[PDB]
Amino acid sequence: HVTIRAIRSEVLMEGEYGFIGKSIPTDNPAGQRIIFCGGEGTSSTTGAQITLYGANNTDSRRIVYNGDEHLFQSADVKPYNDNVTALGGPSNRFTTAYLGSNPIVTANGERKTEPVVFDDAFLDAWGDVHYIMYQWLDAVQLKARIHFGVIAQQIRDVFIAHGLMDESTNCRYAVLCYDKYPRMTDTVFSHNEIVEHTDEEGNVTTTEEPVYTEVVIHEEGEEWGVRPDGIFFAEAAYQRRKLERIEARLSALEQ
Amino acid sequence: HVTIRIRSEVLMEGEYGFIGKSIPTDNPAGQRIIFCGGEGTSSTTGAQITLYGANNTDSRRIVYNGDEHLFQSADVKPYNDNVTALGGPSNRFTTAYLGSNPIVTANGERKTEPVVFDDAFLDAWGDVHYIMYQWLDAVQLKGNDARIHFGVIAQQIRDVFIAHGLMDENSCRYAVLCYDKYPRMTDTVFSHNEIVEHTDEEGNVTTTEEPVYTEVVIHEEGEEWGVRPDGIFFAEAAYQRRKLERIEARLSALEQ
Amino acid sequence: HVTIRIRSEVLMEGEYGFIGKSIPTDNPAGQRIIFCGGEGTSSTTGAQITLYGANNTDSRRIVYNGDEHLFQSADVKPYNDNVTALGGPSNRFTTAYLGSNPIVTANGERKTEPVVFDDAFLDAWGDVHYIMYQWLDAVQLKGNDARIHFGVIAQQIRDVFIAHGLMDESTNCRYAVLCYDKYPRMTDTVFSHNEIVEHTDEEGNVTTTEEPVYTEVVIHEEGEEWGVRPDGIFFAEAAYQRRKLERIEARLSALEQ
Ligand SMILES: [Br-]
Ligand SMILES: [Br-]
Numbered sequence: 058h059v060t061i062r063a064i065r066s067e068v069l070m071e072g073e074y075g076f077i078g079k080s081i082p083t084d085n086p087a088g089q090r091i092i093f094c095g096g097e098g099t100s101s102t103t104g105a106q107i108t109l110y111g112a113n114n115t116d117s118r119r120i121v122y123n124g125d126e127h128l129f130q131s132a133d134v135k136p137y138n139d140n141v142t143a144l145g146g147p148s149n150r151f152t153t154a155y156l157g158s159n160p161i162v163t164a165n166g167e168r169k170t171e172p173v174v175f176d177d178a179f180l181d182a183w184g185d186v187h188y189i190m191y192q193w194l195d196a197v198q199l200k201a202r203i204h205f206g207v208i209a210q211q212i213r214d215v216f217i218a219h220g221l222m223d224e225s226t227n228c229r230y231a232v233l234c235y236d237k238y239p240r241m242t243d244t245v246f247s248h249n250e251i252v253e254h255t256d257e258e259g260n261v262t263t264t265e266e267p268v269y270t271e272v273v274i275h276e277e278g279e280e281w282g283v284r285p286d287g288i289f290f291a292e293a294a295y296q297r298r299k300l301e302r303i304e305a306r307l308s309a310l311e312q
Numbered sequence: 313h314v315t316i317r318i319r320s321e322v323l324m325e326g327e328y329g330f331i332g333k334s335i336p337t338d339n340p341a342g343q344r345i346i347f348c349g350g351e352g353t354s355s356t357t358g359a360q361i362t363l364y365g366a367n368n369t370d371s372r373r374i375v376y377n378g379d380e381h382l383f384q385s386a387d388v389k390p391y392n393d394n395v396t397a398l399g400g401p402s403n404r405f406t407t408a409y410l411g412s413n414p415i416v417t418a419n420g421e422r423k424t425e426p427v428v429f430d431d432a433f434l435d436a437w438g439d440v441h442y443i444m445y446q447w448l449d450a451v452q453l454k455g456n457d458a459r460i461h462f463g464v465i466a467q468q469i470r471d472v473f474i475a476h477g478l479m480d481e482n483s484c485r486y487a488v489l490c491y492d493k494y495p496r497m498t499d500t501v502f503s504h505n506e507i508v509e510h511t512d513e514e515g516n517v518t519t520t521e522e523p524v525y526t527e528v529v530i531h532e533e534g535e536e537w538g539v540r541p542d543g544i545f546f547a548e549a550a551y552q553r554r555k556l557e558r559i560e561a562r563l564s565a566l567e568q
Numbered sequence: 569h570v571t572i573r574i575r576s577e578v579l580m581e582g583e584y585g586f587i588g589k590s591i592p593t594d595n596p597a598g599q600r601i602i603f604c605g606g607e608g609t610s611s612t613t614g615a616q617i618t619l620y621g622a623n624n625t626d627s628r629r630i631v632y633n634g635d636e637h638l639f640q641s642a643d644v645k646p647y648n649d650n651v652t653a654l655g656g657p658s659n660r661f662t663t664a665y666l667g668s669n670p671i672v673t674a675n676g677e678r679k680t681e682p683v684v685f686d687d688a689f690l691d692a693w694g695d696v697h698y699i700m701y702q703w704l705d706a707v708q709l710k711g712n713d714a715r716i717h718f719g720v721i722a723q724q725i726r727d728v729f730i731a732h733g734l735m736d737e738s739t740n741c742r743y744a745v746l747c748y749d750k751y752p753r754m755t756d757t758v759f760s761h762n763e764i765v766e767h768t769d770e771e772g773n774v775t776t777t778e779e780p781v782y783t784e785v786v787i788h789e790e791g792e793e794w795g796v797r798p799d800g801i802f803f804a805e806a807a808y809q810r811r812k813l814e815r816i817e818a819r820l821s822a823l824e825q
């Protein structure tokens with residue numbers, strides 16, 4: 058219930074550091090949060106918004122960055138810690154990454170077991186993997202690009218046929234990755250209602266209060282995925298053997 | 313303005329707090345709030361996050377401006393599934409540093425029936441050249457010693473498809489080769505302070521320093537051809553598999 | 569120090585609003601503002617974003633602390649083109665979850681006229697080994713039941729380049745497929761606890777109140793990493809195996825007749 062007046066309004070915080078927080082709400086602690094907004098209103102149609110969720114909130118310690126552009130200037134977009142958190146998720150995939158150069162994969166000092174050749178039994182299986190062209194039903198419905206890849210289930214049906222994986226829950230090989238995700242809810246702005254106020258004398262006045270609703274973003278679910286790079290490492294090992302053996306049958310027969 | 317007085321604090325009560333920006337009277341195209349770890353409107357002063365209004369020229373933009381962007385305690389995720397991307401045609405990330413290889417999933421979205429690689433597309437993929445290259449500018453500095461990169465030139469894969477009638481001079485049936493046109497990127501940025509002078513009915517002339525913001529071009533309109541290395545390697549795996557099978561064939565027909 | 573009083577509202581007028589942090593009189597090195605969705609200076613209290621001042625030990629750092637980071641209504645983008653990165657040598661993302669495969673583009677940047685993979689290089693590439701492994705970490709927690717990954721060891725590929733004269737036994741490498749990085753240590757100023765602070769009257773009376781104590785921590789010490797570009801590896805492997813297939817076919821076409 059305050060407005061900072063000015064060309065520009067300024068709030069300057071003194072001390073060693075400044076703190077702008079949200080007290081534990083008296084009557085609905087589950088919605089505890091601050092909404093920072095570039096616009097006039099509590100609705101995000103009003104301007105860009107960043108929302109910090111209190112620990113007492115349904116979606117606890119959540120942050121939602123809401124804008125039509127998220128531009129990170131002057132520095133890499135990094136994880137705080139090394140190799141603990143990820144980009145995206147099973148039910149939060151980015152459509153793609155646009156890169157100036159090919160991804161770098163590294164262990165950063167972390168050490169592996171002793172490197173091991175692709176056992177022949179595994180190669181026999183890998184031969185049954187199919188490299189296919191496909192389309193999305195959704196896309197074709199609107200017209201539509203063809204994509205190249207390998208159906209996760211296709212690799213899975215093969216992993217089973219060759220006894221490598223029990224009919225997942227878990228999987229021995231990271232190239233085929235199964236995940237199981239909860240449902241994602243969020244409390245978001247709906248509209249502002251009119252609320253009537255009448256005194257004991259009986260006169261009626263109105264004010265505008267915003268209405269927030271809990272909304273489902275996506276439901277519970279599971280998913281199978283693959284690691285293309287892993288697939289290509291295995292294909293490499295695969296074909297190299299097919300080349301080793303073919304050059305033996307070329308020699309014994311040349312002479 | 314207000315100033316808040318070894319640590320200053322602002323506690324917001326109620327169910328939630330709201331800190332927002334009214335609609336400017338005279339320049340609603342500039343509607344925004346600048347949050348700064350420092351005392352100056354200039355980002356040389358401290359890390360900044362700027363929320364743009366809907367009225368702003370750059371509607372609902374967010375600019376995070378710091379010398380480190382460290383996201384702690386949680387994955388960096390898109391709000392929705394398979395609707396937003398990392399980077400852009402003219403907003404490329406140099407790379408991603410990963411502890412493991414990317415996971416690609418369809419999360420249950422439906423695909424058409426998995427189809428083999430036709431022999432026509434395979435004949436053509438045989439013309440796709442794998443190559444080494446260096447960046448001219450690096451070559452300006454280190455010449456022969458400039459770092460060497462691997463890949464395939466987007467345009468020459470385009471040429472191969474066009475030659476093999478799997479594409480026309482337009483601008484593609486395949487996801488492996490992806491073209492994009494992109495708008496110019498502008499922003500409003502702090503440049504310098506400007507001394508403004510204020511003179512009253514009496515001759516008196518006072519002085520002050522107001523900050524000037526200006527509209528800067530970050531990049532002009534352009535277009536770009538690109539490729540998905542993973543898509544390239546899927547076509548290759550197909551290609552190379554057809555060849556070895558013929559190799560297997562030949563061989564068999566030497567023991568008979 | 570103020571409190572704003574179902575919802576509290578601060579509203580900034582003028583063209584734009586500025587909310588900043590003055591230069592600290594005593595400890596300018598801690599200059600920063602902490603935004604919190606919760607009641608306390610501790611992050612356990614709620615999601616926080618900390619903006620570091622230029623004067624701060626960690627100059628112009630931003631720290632986003634939450635249990636979810638959800639980016640809505642727009643791609644997560646770098647401000648400029650091809651100058652900043654996702655993750656780092658000592659700040660790696662475990663993975664990226666995508667719906668389609670990454671797009672690599674040069675956006676019009678000039679290249680040296682592309683060259684074939686030379687025979688000398690292909691020769692060496694043959695010694696590169698494709699292997700399997702587990703993380704010494706995973707095993708200490710899942711034993712022989714830990715996930716098995718595919719890839720190559722950056723060191724054995726280096727040995728291959730070294731043994732073939734393509735690379736001096738020289739941290740700076742000639743090919744981008746093999747990445748070496750040297751990195752600084754990472755500290756951060758972080759809330760640890762509350763302390764007992766004694767207050768002595770001018771009459772000698774000692775009262776007491778608690779205040780939050782921030783402390784400097786070491787997130788990780790300096791170090792270095794060798795890494796590889798899997799894509800780069802496959803580009804070379806596609807050139808290698810193509811030359812081999814070619815030599816095999818010629819031996820076939822010669823065997824016949
Ligand atoms: Br509103
Ligand atoms: Br599509």
Ligand SMILES: [Br-]
Nearest residue numbers: 205487488543
């Ligand atoms: Br593709």
Ligand SMILES: [Br-]
Nearest residue numbers: 462744745800
């Ligand atoms: Br490379």
Ligand SMILES: [Ca+2]
Nearest residue numbers: 232287717718
């Ligand atoms: Ca793998």
Ligand SMILES: [Cl-]
Nearest residue numbers: 352353354357
């Ligand atoms: Cl300034």
